[PDB]
C-alpha cells in the first residue's frame, strides 16, 4: 500500500530529522566546474575528486543570508534535505560550512531546468505535461505525509535527469509545520490567494501551485501574468481564469478544482485529499506505481554527452568562492 510505504518513509525521515548529518565533506575535496544558476545563493557543477562523481553544489554566503533574514529558512532547507529520500527529489549527498559560506552538495541533473525546455518548445502536450505533473503529485504526497510544505514550485525549480524524469529542487522555503503558517514567500505567478491576502495558510498552497504549473506547462504561459507583481496579484485574487481553446475538458475541470480560491472545494485540501487529484479523469491513463518506479517512457529525454556536460544549462558569470580568514555568523549557523 501507499499507506505502508509512507509509514516506513516517515520512520526513516524522523530519525534523520531528529539527528541531522553535519560536516560530511570539505570544499578542497571538490573541483569547481561551472555555475548552473545564481540569485539569492548560487549553484555550481563540481567533481568529487575521490570518486570522480559529478554533483551540484549550492553555495550560500552566510552574511548575505543574515541580511535577507533567511537564517531559519536556510536551516530548514538543510535539515529537511538531509532527511528526505524520494526518487523525484534532489538528494543531499554532503553538507559543510567554512568561515564565509554554507555548502549543500546534491545529485546532478544534466538535463537542465524544465523552464529552459518549456520556454524553448513553447508548450507541452497534455501527455507530456501529465507525465511531469504525476511526479509532482507523488512528491507532494510524500512531502505532506512528513508534515513538509514546499512553497517553491515552478519550472525554474524542476530539473530533468538523464532519463527525462524530474527532480524537485530548491528547498529554501520548505518547512516542517503541522497546522498553519504565515510567511510571505514564493514566486508571484505561483502564489495562492491566501498568501497574497496575508491569511494563515497550509499545504493547500502547494496544490494551487500545481495548478499554475500544469496550466503553464500545457498553455506555454501562466494563468496569471502581467509586467508587475501587483498586477499579477490583482488577477490571482479576482476569481477568474481563462483556458486556451486547445485545453481538453478534463484538463479545464482539473485546473478549476486546483485553482480554487475556495479552500473547502480545492482539490488536495478536501476530505479525500490527494486521491481527488489521483482519481481525476485527466490522470486516468496514469499508472502511479509505474511513475514511481520510473517504468514509464519519458516523452522527452535530454541529449547525452559527457557526464559533466552543461549544454542544457545557461551560461552565468563565474565569480570567486571567497573564504574569509575570520569566521562569520558562527552562532547563527551552529547547527548547520
Amino acid at each position: 500500500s501507499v499507506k505502508e510505504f509512507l509509514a516506513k518513509a516517515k520512520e526513516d525521515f524522523l530519525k534523520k530529522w531528529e539527528n541531522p548529518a553535519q560536516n560530511t565533506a570539505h570544499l578542497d575535496q571538490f573541483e569547481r566546474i561551472k555555475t548552473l544558476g545564481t540569485g539569492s545563493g548560487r549553484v555550481m557543477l563540481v567533481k568529487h575528486m575521490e570518486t570522480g562523481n559529478h554533483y551540484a553544489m549550492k553555495i550560500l554566503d552566510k552574511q548575505k543570508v543574515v541580511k535577507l533574514k533567511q537564517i531559519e529558512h536556510t536551516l530548514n532547507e538543510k535539515r529537511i534535505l538531509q532527511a528526505v529520500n524520494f526518487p523525484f527529489l534532489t538528494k543531499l549527498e554532503f553538507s559543510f560550512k567554512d568561515n564565509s559560506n554554507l555548502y549543500m552538495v546534491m545529485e546532478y541533473a544534466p538535463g537542465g531546468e524544465m523552464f529552459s525546455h518549456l520556454r524553448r518548445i513553447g508548450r507541452f502536450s497534455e501527455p507530456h505535461a501529465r507525465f511531469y505533473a504525476a511526479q509532482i503529485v507523488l512528491t507532494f504526497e510524500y512531502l505532506h505525509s512528513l508534515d513538509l510544505i514546499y512553497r517553491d514550485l515552478k519550472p525554474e525549480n524542476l530539473m530533468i535527469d538523464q532519463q527525462g524524469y524530474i527532480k524537485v529542487t530548491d528547498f529554501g522555503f520548505a518547512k516542517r509545520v503541522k497546522g498553519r503558517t504565515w510567511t510571505l514567500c514564493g514566486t508571484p505567478e505561483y502564489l495562492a490567494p491566501e498568501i497574497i491576502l496575508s491569511k494563515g495558510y497550509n499545504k493547500a498552497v502547494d496544490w494551487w501551485a500545481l495548478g499554475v504549473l500544469i496550466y503553464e506547462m500545457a498553455a506555454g504561459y501562466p494563468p496569471f501574468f502581467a509586467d508587475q507583481p501587483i498586477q499579477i496579484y490583482e488577477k490571482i485574487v479576482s476569481g477568474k481564469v481563462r483556458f486556451p481553446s486547445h485545453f481538453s475538458s478534463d484538463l479545464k475541470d482539473l485546473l478549476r478544482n486546483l485553482l480554487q480560491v475556495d479552500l473547502t472545494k480545492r482539490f488536495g485540501n478536501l476530505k479525500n485529499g490527494v486521491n481527488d487529484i489521483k482519481n481525476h479523469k485527466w490522470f486516468a491513463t496514469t499508472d502511479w506505481i509505474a511513475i514511481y518506479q520510473r517504468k514509464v517512457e519519458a516523452p522527452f529525454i535530454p541529449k547525452f554527452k559527457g557526464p559533466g556536460d552543461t549544454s542544457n544549462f545557461d551560461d552565468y558569470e563565474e565569480e570567486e568562492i571567497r573564504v574569509s580568514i575570520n569566521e562569520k555568523c558562527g552562532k547563527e549557523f551552529s547547527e548547520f
Binding site: 540569485g39 535577507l68 533574514k69 533567511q70 523552464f115 520556454r119 513553447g122 517553491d152 515552478k154 525554474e156 529554501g172 522555503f173 510567511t183 510571505l184 514567500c185 514564493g186 514566486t187 508571484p188 505567478e189 498553455a219 506555454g220 504561459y221 501574468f225 502581467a226 509586467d227 507583481p229 499579477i232 481563462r242 486556451p244
Partner: peptide, 20 residues
C-alpha cells in the same frame, strides 16, 4: 493573442522569489 502578449511581457525569463 495571449501567447503574443506573454512573449512581449517582461516576465518570460526566470522569475525571482519574493519575501518580506
Amino acid at each position: 493573442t495571449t501567447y503574443a502578449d506573454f512573449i512581449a511581457s517582461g516576465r518570460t525569463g526566470r522569475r525571482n522569489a519574493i519575501h518580506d
